[PDB]
Amino acid sequence: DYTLTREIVTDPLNVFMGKLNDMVNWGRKNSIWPYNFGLSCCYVEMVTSFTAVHDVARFGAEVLRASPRQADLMVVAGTCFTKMAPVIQRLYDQMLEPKWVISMGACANSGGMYDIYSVVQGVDKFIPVDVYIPGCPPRPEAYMQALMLLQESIGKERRPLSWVVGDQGVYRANMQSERERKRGERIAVTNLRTPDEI
């Protein structure tokens, strides 16, 4: 099952064009350039993930450009304030295709604990979001897990290869949700370690 934005359609993918599309998606998922955007706590956990004790560089995502033109992925790592919501919208509009959005934290997901007059309740109110991460803050390894989720989503999509030949239509993959996928093993947990130990 696939989603069009230019709807619900089927997989359209000839075998040579599919192979080149596979290599294009492979090169796109194996090189993701996030935008250096410092909002709040979750950005500090992102730069914790970037450092040597964690080494997100192994996935080829250590670039962290300061310009929206060079960067591909927008990580909303913090609260969407009413003053910074046009700033986030302009920074998203100043990006280039392909563009992916990862919302770090309950602030970026839904507004989090701050149901307040000066906070936008989630960045998905006005920009599309590819991957959400819960946590306040999510740990750096959760950020890497969402990075592999984004890589899996990129490796299955079918973007147009060229702007002169082909269907100019964004083909995102309706992946199986992680809750239903991991319900087979999360329920089977019986005994955990007692909290008195370390």
Ligand X SMILES: C/C=C(/C)[C@H](O)[C@H](C)/C=C(C)\C=C/C/C(C)=C\Cc1[nH]c(OC)c(OC)c(=O)c1C
Applying CB under 6 A, among 136, 148, 161, 175 the residue interacting with ligand SF4 is: 136
* Positions in 51-90 near ligand X (CB under 6 A): 62-64
CA distance 67 to 189: 45
In the list 129, 155, 156, 170, the residue contacting other proteins (rule: CB under 8 A) is 129
Q: Which stretch binds other proteins (CB under 8 A): 13-21, 22-30, 138-146, 157-165?
A: 138-146
Is residue 137 at the binding interface for other proteins, with CB under 8 A as the rule? Answer: yes
- Map the footprint of other proteins across residues 178-197, applying CB under 8 A: 178-180, 182-183, 186-197
Query: What 3-state class would DSSP assign to 70?
Result: coil
Least Å distance, CB 135 to ligand SF4, is 7
Site for ligand X in 18-57 (CB under 6 A): 47, 50
Of all helices (H) and strands (E), which one includes residue 73?
Answer: strand 73-77
Q: How far is CA 92 from CA 69, 129, 155, in A?
A: 10, 11, 22
| CA nearest to 146, candidates 80, 75, 88 | 75
Cα gap 42→35, rounded to integer Å = 14
